[PDB]
Amino acid sequence: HSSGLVPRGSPYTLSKRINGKWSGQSAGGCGNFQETHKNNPIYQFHIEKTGPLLIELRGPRQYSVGFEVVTVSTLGDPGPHGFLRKSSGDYRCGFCYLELENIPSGIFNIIPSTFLPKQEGPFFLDFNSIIPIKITQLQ
């Protein structure tokens, strides 16, 4: 993996970049498009030690983008920073992010999308951390 765009000397000392795209079936659009949102790409990552994670998504300037993070498996006891699903928030043009300073140890999925379906194009997902994170693509 290459790296994202992180200041020199950032507290996030590791940056792992995933390059993907929306194309054909996988251009599913946001959650409003309930028939196709679940067709978007899905990446899966492991947090080995609870600690800070910041995820950035970039797509074309002219696309409004967002992502959701879903807890798949946390084996630790039920802490305050536990969740079912979180998101980058409002769709934004070109760039969005989510900072999880105390994400629990476990398995999570991340689903990046454009606002409307059938918006084809590239994206980068950057995972900025202090501990290495294993990632794989599910679809």
- The CB-side HSE value for 13 (13 A sphere, CA atoms) comes to 4
Which residue from 35, 62, 78, 84 is in contact with Br ion, where contact means CB under 5 A?
Answer: 35
The amino acid at 8: R
Which residue from 2, 3, 13, 73 is in contact with Br ion, where contact means CB under 5 A?
Answer: 2
Binding to Br ion by residue 118, rule CB under 5 A?
no
Nearest-approach distance from CB 126 to Br ion, in angstroms: 8
**Distance of alpha carbon 109 from alpha carbon 101, whole angstroms:** 17
Nearest-approach distance from CB 76 to Br ion, in angstroms: 14
**Which positions from 70 to 89 touch Br ion by CB under 5 A, shown as an x/- string?**
x----------x---xxxxx
CB-CB contact of 129 with 14 (8 Å): yes
Which residue from 3, 73, 102, 130 is in contact with Br ion, where contact means CB under 5 A?
Answer: 102
Give Cβ neighbours of residue 99 (< 8 Å, ≥ 6 apart). Answer: 52, 53, 54, 55
Tokens 């918006």, located at residue? 119
Question: Residue 55 is encoded by which pair of tokens?
Answer: 């995820």
Binding to Br ion by residue 95, rule CB under 5 A?
yes
Q: How many CB atoms lie within 10 A of CB 107?
A: 15
Binding to Br ion by residue 96, rule CB under 5 A?
yes
Please give the residue ranges that form the binding site for Br ion (CB under 5 A): 2, 14, 17, 19, 24-25, 33, 35, 58, 70, 81, 85-92, 95-96, 100, 102, 109, 132, 134-135, 137, 139
